[PDB]
Symmetry: D4
Subunit: 159 residues, 8 copies
């Protein structure tokens, strides 16, 4: 036969449909879940330094051509900063536009750096969405932060 | 020369996630809708014969490298058998296993043939064998009918 | 894995043959029409912002690997500058040499932006610099305006 | 940048437009001319046997991925039979549908086998379009005949 | 740049080097371990039927281009035969010549098939290596079986 | 994911030029010498068995994509039959046409095989260019013998 | 099958073989002839301006992936300089090392530029080969000039 | 126009397995021996000048796509500086991470260079793994020396 099939247009019209029907919020949660899932299908070994983890992670991202990543350990607060380039673009959906697949990275990365034996054991992944940084960086560049889960206040425990 | 992103592992986990959360029926209507959606994005010209229509449809399928299709007219009803080969496979989801994307076709062909706002245009698509059993048919061969 | 046919030597001789027989003006209207034609075959969704529109247009251009485009709104008229990079080149035909396919874009963008049957939709495209001189602009960069 | 651009959809909508405006006849003549032209841009050396010419011709067709060809010298009348597979399909135009580019082959081949020093010096190329043969063979398979130009009768000389 | 590096020449000579130093037994255990290792880096989701697992595994194999596979539930032993096409050839090493990487599949399939929660924990994968089963199928075809592990009393030594 | 230059048209003209200026006979020695020299640049390891040698030679062949080979060790007298499939074809030069590159294999195989420890060290290579076992085999299939 | 054969290893050793037997002069004439030959098999259409010819030639070069070229009309000599990027390298042969196929371009450009009906009949192509013109540009860059041929009276010998 | 298998993930697991079971020190000899052995299988012709040797080595390097090399013949004492760019990276193994394959080049270059007639026959290869000329050079750039 021939070189295998194209899923952009599909994802283009899928993302549109899902957006049409579901909150920005609902969609993102579905999309993180899918990230977690992706991270359980493919994973790095147990790396001993962030630097090694980075090489390992890029290796994985190259399996599927989903771009490149840099990991900077911000020792001064002990957070981990995830800077990911060329998130695949699937049409104009997402905030900002072109960036719909972003929360998959959140799922994918949280699954990946948590799998890391003991180190970033119970961290959480926030995406950075602050204005100033987003137009310092290109469209498809996504900035995330990995920091340690602070637990809920009881005031919040009301769901 | 140059190459870029793949989406299939994503769809493997998406299909799964979706199926786990919504069920077969809701997932399928969603998938018909997306099928219809694509059909508004890329489309054939106004074809004069079923044969010509086939070519124009295969051209479009080639564009995204989803499979190939044979349209063939049925003299019983002016009904229309649609045989699609090599539907992209995205893991083991769907019924039968590996045909998760099948409703996209019902939607897609739903749009395309109706685009010919003439004889067909008041028509519908149904996706299984309408003997209601697909006989000796490869996985990734999806058989549909267009009628009314 | 597998690969197939190329059409560029054909277009080199076609462009030439056509130009030799019809002239610049008739060839160009023909080429706008074909531009429009493509625009009915493949098209974006109803975009809400000029930015979103850009992405959806680049997606389509990527589909056939004609170049890339930046749309940018002009606060003087709600006018619209269109900058298209890497128009396919098919030999030395056209003005400037190598831009034979340029009118296809006037036609194509003519269709696409009008598809947004709202603010634009009663608009027109004109293809040269409308300073009427393209300044320090690479060959295969085609600059157009959308107005009225 | 990236792998270079796709001309099918263009040709698809071009062939449609030209057909819309111009006779089947006018178009074919334009298309043969383009064939002649193509044959003047690329050409075989002077081959000494049809068999060699065939290898040479296929070589050229492979430059542009325009399919494969077989040449059988029909000694018994001294005509040359050209059987060409996978004429590139450009939409549904042409007679039969899918076959619009066929008369380019007529131009291309006549130019190619005529360039041949002295041998098929002043032959002409007819396409075979007879019903029976066309559905013995696939869509994109085109059958042509190269035979020696018989001159016009004066009765025909009235244009 | 240009589509990057080829590793066959590396493996042809790496396989030769290793074979020179090391018994064919030790080499196999090494290879089985890496196979078990590969299966930790890339895994299937939890499948409900063998058939699903087969689609799922083939999908994984496709990622790295290591051929295709067919699983077959043999209802009488509750054993499972694994027939794998087009193992990548890396020179003339292994038994038979060309199948050096076969022990890898043993580790790979063993990990993969086990990850499945259902029935399989404490199943072992062993390669079928028998005259006229090797003669019947092309050489880059590797045939394995998956049976339930048994344990051993007298059989404990050392 | 990128790509580079093509030498067929060149080699089509080269063979043509060469055959025109020097004989058929001296063209063939040239190519045998070249074939021999290629063999020095790329070479298999010390092979225990003929089966193993084959895999090894194919490895090398695959690496420059010059087709595939079969080695048949002949029982009756101490021969070694070499069947090479898919010799690169470089225009209509050679005999039969399109087989110009063939002596390269005489040189090439002559080298690889005699580099083999002790068993084959002192062998020759004539290509069996007989019509009887030719009108039956593909144009780009070349049949050789290792003997003495 | 799979995308077919690579000829560099052939040319590396063919170039070496030829160089061994034959003066570097004879080898060049041979190569120039094949270049003239290549230009008979693939040609530009009749161009009106140098610029058009440049688009047209680059188009031909693209067909076989033999690099890109820039032409430049030098108004004073009515001469024409041809600057060609990325000549395919085929081992270390030629002068300088790596440019063996350069004589080919001489034949190629000579044929191509001549096919143009206009001014050029009886123009000759000669390669520029001068210290610090070779040092200035990358090595797979070949610089040639195209001037009108002159003829010779005393200069006829043999 | 077709394509086949990938060994990176394998080699990611292999290095990992190997480093875990055998030392850093014995892993490196293994790889040097392998590198040496690769050098026997593929090899350049007898090179007149160091410049020529470079082109030749790159030719070989390109053939398996293991990156590019520079040879600097050192005047002060009789050294030969080897700078290899784009060593295939095979996971985070090695020191620095992702440079596991590096000793292969010690073996590889050690071989190719000493195969060279008379000038270099008796040389050694230690890779200058100094932080000073490392925190400046790319991770996949490897710097070696030929001496004695
Ligand atoms: O000649 C027979 C056949 O031709 C058809 O026309 C072309 C067709 O245009 C080509 O698509 C097809 O073959 C491959 C294409 O060369 C390649 O461009 C395509 O991959 C596209 C993909 O289709 C597209 O959805 C994707 O979108 C991008 C988005 O726009 C961006 O937002 C995002 O960032 O990136 C994605 C993906 O990169 O772009 C990719 C390009 O990477 O894959 C095709 C199949 O493998 O070739 C045909 C001919 O050569 C014509 O319509 C028919 O009439 C005819 O039968
Ligand atoms: O060498 C350094 C680098 O290597 C990485 O490993 C490889 C990796 O294995 C490759 O994926 C990658 O480059 C391309 C692959 O060659 C190609 O296989 C892949 O496309 C795959 C896709 O990844 C996969 O999801 C897809 O699944 C199929 C399903 O299994 C089926 O159900 C369905 O029917 O079809 C789909 C699609 O066909 O298969 C396709 C193959 O068509 O695309 C990759 C990018 O374009 O190359 C790497 C080598 O560079 C290694 O992980 C890294 O550590 C290391 O840095
Ligand atoms: O080896 C046996 C076989 O070899 C034949 O020679 C080559 C031949 O040179 C190749 O064309 C062919 O396979 C593909 C080519 O690698 C590729 O270059 C070609 O695509 C070309 C296209 O042919 C050409 O028209 C196009 O023109 C450009 C213009 O010049 C520019 O103005 C414009 O901007 O861009 C266009 C397009 O980019 O360039 C493209 C390159 O992108 O496609 C070929 C088929 O897919 O390989 C052969 C080797 O097999 C030789 O002739 C035979 O004798 C012999 O049998
Ligand atoms: O796995 C089975 C098989 O594997 C073999 O190993 C590889 C092999 O290394 C590859 O060559 C082969 O497939 C293609 C290669 O990916 C590609 O590099 C090659 O093209 C090479 C060409 O071979 C080489 O001569 C050429 O030389 C350059 C010069 O060095 C430069 O001076 C000059 O400027 O440029 C030329 C050419 O650009 O480089 C090109 C790269 O462009 O083509 C191969 C065939 O299409 O893949 C195999 C893996 O599948 C292994 O040896 C065998 O043991 C085994 O059977």
């Amino acid at each position: 036969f021939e070189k295998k099939p194209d899923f952009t247009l599909f994802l283009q019209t899928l993302s549109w449909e899902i957006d049409d029907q579901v909150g920005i919020e609902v969609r993102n949660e579905l999309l993180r879940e899918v990230g977690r899932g992706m991270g359980t299908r493919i994973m790095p070994p147990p790396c001993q330094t962030v630097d090694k983890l980075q090489i390992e992670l890029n290796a994985l991202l190259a399996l599927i051509g989903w771009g490149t990543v840099t990991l900077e350990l911000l020792s001064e607060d002990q957070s981990l900063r995830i800077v990911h380039e060329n998130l695949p673009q699937v049409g104009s959906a997402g905030e900002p536009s072109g960036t719909w697949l972003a929360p998959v990275l959140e799922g994918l990365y949280g699954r990946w750096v948590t799998s890391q034996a003991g180190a970033f054991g119970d961290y959480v992944v926030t995406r950075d969405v602050d204005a100033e940084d987003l137009n310092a960086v290109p469209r498809q560049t996504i900035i995330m932060y990995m920091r340690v889960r602070s637990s809920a206040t009881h005031h919040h425990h009301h769901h």
